[PDB]
Amino acid sequence: SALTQPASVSGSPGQSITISCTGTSSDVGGFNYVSWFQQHPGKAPKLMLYDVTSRPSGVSSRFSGSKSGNTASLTISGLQAEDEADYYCSSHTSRGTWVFGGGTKLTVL
Template identity: 85%
Template sequence: QSALTQPASVSGSPGQSITISCTGTSSDVGGYDYVSWYQQHPGKAPKVIIYDVTNRPSGVSNRFSASKSGNTASLTISGLQAEDEADYYCESFAGGVYVFGTGTKVTVL
């Protein structure tokens, strides 16, 4: 089970939109509609911000949206804010086990 592939870093100015990709295979991302995204601030535990490809848990800003096409999932952050600066990880169910993405550091310029 190899890690899903994400860009190492993405940056944007306040107010801009950025998109993070997450590429897997037909055994994980492409095979199930169980892709989640997690936000992790330094020294903190991860927090789920998207689940089941497109759903936001209660309390998560609607500036976060996501989608999936084939073996690639994407997370978009709209109206980028300073508090969005963090590491972001995609994750997929892979038939009994789970696999994370390699992680993307988002920098707000």
């Protein structure tokens, strides 16, 4: 009952990075309740994605997500210097509880 997004990824500015997250068939394999967060180290984690492809107001169109069964992938196209922060996934289980991801540390230089 935990999400398994990897430890840390990196990519040069201008490229595109992909952040994946695998889970059970009770939270991500059947349901669309998958969201993402931007945990800056000196800030509360900010909501960067709604439902698997959707997006809050204020968040730029740089961020896009997808889901291919038990795996939900986050894609950041055209990275900048303002992405050096942690990324935490989320899922609502069929049981009624919420599980979060381990956390990916992103660097560009």
